[PDB]
Design a protein around this ligand. Structure first.
Ligand code: OVR
Ligand code: AKG
Ligand code: FE2
Ligand code: SR
Ligand code: SR
Length: 327
């Protein structure tokens, strides 16, 4: 592979990462209190769980994966239309809601992730936003509009389960804290040397909560510097708690630290729905949960200020929130 994609020695993935047998798989059609309790335990102990029987149509999940795969099969002349000034955009502020193709890496030793990402905003859905989405394939806009609404519906159900678990009023996150919905469609082409590369460097999702749809292996979670493989369940969503939710819960909940490894033989598409605050938001531990026994571990901070650090500084997983740590 090009030296551009060679990860630093310490960040390279070992070849035999074990299946995470203890990754919670939570059936959302269990009794209400059982669902709240199982989600609460997963949030406290892991920060990553899968949801099944989640009420989002399986047919729509399949149709969305199909149209996302069809997009990444488009020829160069079509993909160029989403490359500003002839090259992929960077994950940096301002992060615009119009559709673009993105490149990503780390400036520490600088290297690139073995990944192409299509990203666009999804909320609120209006003609201007959808008109800024891919023109091809022809059905992308119709399918992904329906998917966007359904994934948001499921995310808001999960956030209300989280509210009940924490003792926050229902709808606590149904406001500026969930206003941005970025859909990141990740394409991992086959890689000649998986031992040297990463599809996605180890990270927290910096936002509130992410729902991830996958049908192939490659996703790994950090649990004593131990990585585990997250079983692909094509009809499930992987729920990743973001660094923003870790802060708001005053670390009562864990954030998901995860990475993606490359494959030498097959390509892989994943669909990540990033829900989180507007860039104008102030983030702090929920005052409702604080006491002398539970003092705040973070001072209030600008989500925009956090965002700039989160997207630039990859010296540590929580580099984005280190400046705001107290007590
Ligand atoms: C591997 N990279 C991580 C960092 C960055 O994430 C973002 O760009 C999100 C997109 O919502 C973001 C979160 C919080 C603040 C700003 C941006 C781009 C991608 C994502 O898949 C996660
Ligand atoms: O491709 C995956 O399974 C992970 C995607 C992801 O972590 C992300 O987009 O943030
Ligand atoms: Fe992620
Ligand atoms: Sr180009
Ligand atoms: Sr347009």
């Amino acid at each position: 592979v090009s030296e551009s994609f060679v990860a630093p020695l310490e960040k390279r993935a070992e070849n035999d990462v074990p299946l995470g047998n203890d990754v919670p798989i939570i059936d959302l059609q269990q009794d209400h209190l059982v669902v709240v309790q199982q989600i609460t335990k997963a949030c406290q102990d892991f920060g990553l769980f899968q949801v099944i029987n989640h009420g989002l149509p399986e047919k729509l999940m399949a149709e969305t994966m199909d149209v996302c795969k069809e997009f990444f099969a488009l020829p160069a002349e079509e993909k160029e239309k989403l490359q500003p000034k002839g090259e992929p955009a960077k994950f940096e502020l301002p992060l615009e809601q119009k559709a673009k193709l993105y490149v990503e890496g780390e400036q520490l030793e600088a290297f690139l992730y073995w990944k192409d990402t299509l990203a666009h905003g999804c909320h609120p859905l209006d003609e201007e936003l959808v008109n800024s989405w891919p023109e091809k394939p022809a059905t992308y806009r119709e399918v992904v509009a329906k998917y966007s609404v359904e994934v948001r519906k499921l995310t808001m159900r999960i956030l209300d389960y989280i509210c009940e678990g924490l003792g926050l009023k229902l709808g606590y996150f149904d406001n500026e804290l969930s206003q941005i919905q970025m859909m990141l469609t990740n394409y991992y082409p086959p890689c000649p040397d998986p031992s040297s590369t990463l599809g996605s460097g180890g990270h927290y999702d910096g936002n509130l909560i992410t729902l991830l749809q996958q049908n192939l292996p490659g996703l790994q979670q950090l649990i004593d510097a131990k990585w585990i493989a997250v079983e692909p369940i094509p009809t499930a969503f992987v729920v990743n708690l973001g660094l923003t939710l870790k802060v708001i819960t005053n670390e009562k909940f864990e954030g998901s630290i995860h990475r993606v490894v490359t494959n030498p033989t097959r390509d892989r598409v994943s669909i990540a729905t990033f829900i989180g605050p507007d860039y104008s938001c102030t983030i702090e531990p929920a005052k409702e949960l604080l006491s002398q026994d539970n003092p705040p571990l973070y001072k209030p901070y600008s989500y925009a200020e956090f965002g700039e650090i989160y997207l630039s500084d990859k010296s540590d997983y929580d580099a984005g929130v280190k400046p705001y740590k107290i007590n």
